[PDB]
Write an enzyme that holds these catalytic residues in place. Structure first.
Site, PDB file in Angstrom:
ATOM      1  N   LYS A  96      -8.720  18.999 -42.213  1.00  0.00           N
ATOM      2  CA  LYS A  96      -9.125  17.651 -41.837  1.00  0.00           C
ATOM      3  C   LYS A  96      -9.877  16.980 -42.980  1.00  0.00           C
ATOM      4  O   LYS A  96      -9.576  15.843 -43.358  1.00  0.00           O
ATOM      5  CB  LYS A  96      -9.983  17.674 -40.577  1.00  0.00           C
ATOM      6  N   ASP A 130     -10.705  11.449 -35.177  1.00  0.00           N
ATOM      7  CA  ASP A 130     -10.006  12.510 -34.527  1.00  0.00           C
ATOM      8  C   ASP A 130      -9.304  11.829 -33.358  1.00  0.00           C
ATOM      9  O   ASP A 130      -9.684  10.736 -32.967  1.00  0.00           O
ATOM     10  CB  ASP A 130     -10.964  13.617 -34.088  1.00  0.00           C
ATOM     11  N   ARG A 156      -2.107  28.519 -28.252  1.00  0.00           N
ATOM     12  CA  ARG A 156      -1.926  27.471 -27.251  1.00  0.00           C
ATOM     13  C   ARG A 156      -0.527  26.872 -27.321  1.00  0.00           C
ATOM     14  O   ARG A 156       0.087  26.579 -26.294  1.00  0.00           O
ATOM     15  CB  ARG A 156      -2.984  26.361 -27.409  1.00  0.00           C
ATOM     16  N   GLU A 178      -7.119  16.009 -23.770  1.00  0.00           N
ATOM     17  CA  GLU A 178      -6.500  16.855 -24.780  1.00  0.00           C
ATOM     18  C   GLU A 178      -4.985  16.901 -24.572  1.00  0.00           C
ATOM     19  O   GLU A 178      -4.512  17.480 -23.592  1.00  0.00           O
ATOM     20  CB  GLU A 178      -7.103  18.265 -24.734  1.00  0.00           C
ATOM     21  N   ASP A 218      -7.768  13.581 -30.080  1.00  0.00           N
ATOM     22  CA  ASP A 218      -8.065  14.131 -28.760  1.00  0.00           C
ATOM     23  C   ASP A 218      -9.573  14.130 -28.444  1.00  0.00           C
ATOM     24  O   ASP A 218     -10.381  14.680 -29.194  1.00  0.00           O
ATOM     25  CB  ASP A 218      -7.469  15.550 -28.639  1.00  0.00           C
ATOM     26  N   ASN A 248     -13.574  21.555 -34.762  1.00  0.00           N
ATOM     27  CA  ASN A 248     -12.365  21.206 -35.494  1.00  0.00           C
ATOM     28  C   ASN A 248     -12.657  20.177 -36.587  1.00  0.00           C
ATOM     29  O   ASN A 248     -11.932  20.085 -37.583  1.00  0.00           O
ATOM     30  CB  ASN A 248     -11.329  20.660 -34.499  1.00  0.00           C
ATOM     31  N   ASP A 284     -15.059  14.844 -32.200  1.00  0.00           N
ATOM     32  CA  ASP A 284     -15.769  15.406 -31.048  1.00  0.00           C
ATOM     33  C   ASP A 284     -15.908  16.922 -31.100  1.00  0.00           C
ATOM     34  O   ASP A 284     -16.648  17.489 -30.312  1.00  0.00           O
ATOM     35  CB  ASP A 284     -15.069  15.019 -29.736  1.00  0.00           C
ATOM     36  N   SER A 334      -5.709  14.709 -37.185  1.00  0.00           N
ATOM     37  CA  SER A 334      -5.610  15.476 -35.978  1.00  0.00           C
ATOM     38  C   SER A 334      -4.920  16.805 -36.268  1.00  0.00           C
ATOM     39  O   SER A 334      -4.072  16.889 -37.196  1.00  0.00           O
ATOM     40  CB  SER A 334      -4.869  14.696 -34.958  1.00  0.00           C
ATOM     41  N   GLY A 335      -5.286  17.831 -35.497  1.00  0.00           N
ATOM     42  CA  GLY A 335      -4.617  19.121 -35.525  1.00  0.00           C
ATOM     43  C   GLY A 335      -3.502  19.122 -34.497  1.00  0.00           C
ATOM     44  O   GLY A 335      -2.787  20.121 -34.306  1.00  0.00           O
TER      45      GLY A 335
HETATM   46 MG   LIG Z   1     -11.024  16.295 -30.642  1.00  0.00          MG
END
Ligand SMILES: [Mg+2]
Ligand SMILES: [Mg+2]
Lengths: 396, 396
Positions: B316, B183, B228, B192, B185, B342, B339, B271-272
């Site tokens: 993911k 991942d 967001r 982030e 972030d 997600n 982390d 990653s998103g």
């Molecule tokens: Mg993350």
């Protein structure tokens, strides 16, 4: 933790020693810097390096608590200030494999003798196999510049004492081997297919003769190939399917390939032989890459020629390089296994070049040699143990 | 060699012991079945199993010759008939990693306690690092069906004693890990990115709030993303390049990626987040695969939307699967490090799923968790030592 202390426990192994020692240590203000423990033939060694307050290391309380708990149960323990002492040991620089059937004490003794002579420290010894060959590993730390000298010493030992002896770089990169190629005839496969073809023409004798000369490096490969294939001129192409069916794998070959796939190896064959014979077998063994020569066929009949270009000594090496490139694998991480002078440049090009029941000319330049008719001994040279192989096979 | 004998040497390590023992053995009719040797904190154990003729094992000549040579120099030696004795030890079934800063004796003691309780044998202990965290490994043999119980015990220990504790299958297949994804972030990258973007719109506060909720699993990912990103509506796309330049790698990240390449790993990010930020950094770090979402831009201005489809929690996992397929790597041989919630399906899908300074919801389902802000501690969980990493780095 202002200063450090070393606790060392030895004696006859018993259950719960490890937990007992640390449960005792927990009653003092102790943090761990390093722990090392092994049991060999029921002999325990447990070395524990701690930093405890200056207040504690001055104290017979820790000492008495540890000495009493360990001695009570029958083991021995020492306790000393360290400070100057290294926390974690450095990695070994090389590993040495010794295979034999048998491995005499004299043989192993000669290995140790040569190792000590060059100021090489033996960091560890363990068994890697008890079948089909006795296999031992010595991880060692070699003084810089002495490794060339070491390989030479051990080659002499290998020849004189009747054991296989391989020295390998034990670095991270060099033992992340990801790609392997096999020669086919007398390596992955028993015997010489071209002799099986020649038998059908009644020419087995002369072709066996030339093949032997060519694999010893006495004859240029390309010419030896053209001459031998010429003897096939006239045979019906049906002969290809027949000989192909008579092909027997080298003992341990299935185990080898299977284990290599478990390890995520890209796998291939590079042969000066004939693709119509090799590709059927390659597909079945689920290989990733084939390079072979090709028989010229006219009207369903062999012409006695091969269709150029001819995979020769340089050609094999070129094919490995090609395969490695298709596969995204650096040459240092490639392995090549062959038996003939046909293979010299392929072995040289490989990160690890392995001679398998090989002619002298190949042995002479190989990174390592193997002298028993078991192809799975290749696995031992790739850092695999018999027990690991059997374990994985047991789960199916 | 009709019957077998076990020779065991212990005591303070000295040079030439190994060679001396075998030089002595060579004078008798001795073949080797197995050799095991280590030195721990200057304590030598050398266990040698030989088969000598029935004629020899009956003889005090071998005994006296060995006892005299070893005792002369100051070590101890025992010699006994074996026969019933196993030749080579079986492989360990699992390995346990303990990382901490510090690792108290109480912590390690708790680990040992739990291990012994489940009838798990400790086969070996060693240090794997002294920096940036103390790292210890225990290779163990676990009774069948008890491993689930073991992971549970050790998770409790990990939480209560303030150390990271990972249990891994020690089989051939399961430790030939060939592919890894990170991942981005709060994993590969500090902080982030979306909060850095939101700061430019003066919305950092609310977006930080929602991001935190979303990574804890309180909010559905897709909706949290749309909401967001909406806050960015109006920012000039120039903002992408700015935030991208402010990006700092997680401590140890370069070491991690570099070591993984040395090991031949396929490497990627899932990653998103946003590809215009991630792909620049990915190219520079020389990664093999990127999957990211994409910001919608109109007239050089952010719209506040993302261009579908949206990489979500299932997404993911789907990307890892895809990557593994492009790469020819089975899922058991893949690693994922994240982390956030997600990441839950990506970690679950991976052969080894690693939670890195992670929200509880991720820790809860991860194969392993890591609690210090050093991404290179990932390497310890992949069977690499600090010394090995430093060694390879020293050669450049
Ligand atoms: Mg993350
Ligand atoms: Mg050959």
């Amino acid at each position: 933790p202002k200063v450090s202390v070393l606790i060392t426990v030895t004696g006859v192994d018993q259950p719960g020693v490890t937990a007992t020692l640390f449960e005792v240590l927990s009653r003092h203000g102790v943090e761990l810097l390093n722990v090392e423990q092994v049991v060999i033939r029921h002999r325990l060694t447990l070395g524990v390096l701690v930093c405890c307050p200056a207040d504690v290391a001055d104290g017979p309380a820790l000492r008495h608590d540890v000495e009493a708990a360990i001695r009570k149960v029958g083991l021995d323990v020492s306790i000393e200030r360290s400070d100057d002492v290294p926390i974690i040991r450095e990695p070994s620089t090389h590993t040495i494999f010794v295979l034999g059937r048998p491995i005499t004490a004299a043989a192993f003794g000669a290995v140790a003798r040569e190792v000590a002579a060059l100021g090489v420290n033996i960091d560890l010894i363990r068994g890697v196999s008890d079948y089909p060959v006795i296999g031992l590993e010595l991880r060692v730390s070699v003084p810089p510049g002495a490794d060339g000298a070491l390989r030479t010493a051990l080659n002499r030992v290998s020849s004189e004492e009747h054991v296989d002896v391989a020295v390998e770089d034990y670095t991270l990169e060099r033992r992340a081997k990801r790609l392997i190629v096999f020669d086919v005839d007398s390596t992955l496969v028993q015997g010489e297919v071209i002799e099986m073809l020649a038998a059908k023409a009644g020419a087995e004798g002369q072709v066996a003769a030339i093949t032997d000369a060519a694999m010893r490096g006495e004859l240029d490969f390309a010419q030896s190939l053209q001459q031998r294939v010429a003897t096939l001129a006239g045979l019906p192409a049906t002969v290809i399917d027949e000989v192909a069916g008579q092909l027997e794998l080298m003992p341990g070959a299935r185990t080898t390939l299977r284990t290599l796939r478990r390890l995520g190896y890209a796998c291939g064959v590079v042969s000066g032989g004939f693709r119509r014979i090799i590709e059927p077998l390659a597909e079945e063994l689920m290989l990733d890459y084939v390079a072979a020569n090709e028989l010229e066929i006219v009207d369903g009949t062999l012409t006695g020629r091969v269709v150029g270009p001819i995979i020769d000594r340089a050609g094999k090496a070129t094919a490995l390089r090609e395969f490695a490139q298709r596969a995204g694998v650096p040459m240092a991480q490639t392995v090549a296994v062959g038996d003939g002078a046909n293979d010299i440049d392929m072995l040289a090009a490989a990160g690890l070049g392995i001679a398998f029941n090989a002619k002298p000319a190949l042995r002479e330049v190989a990174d390592a040699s193997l002298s028993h008719p078991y192809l799975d001994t290749v696995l031992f040279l790739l850092g695999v143990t018999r027990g690991e192989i059997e374990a994985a096979d047991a789960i199916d």
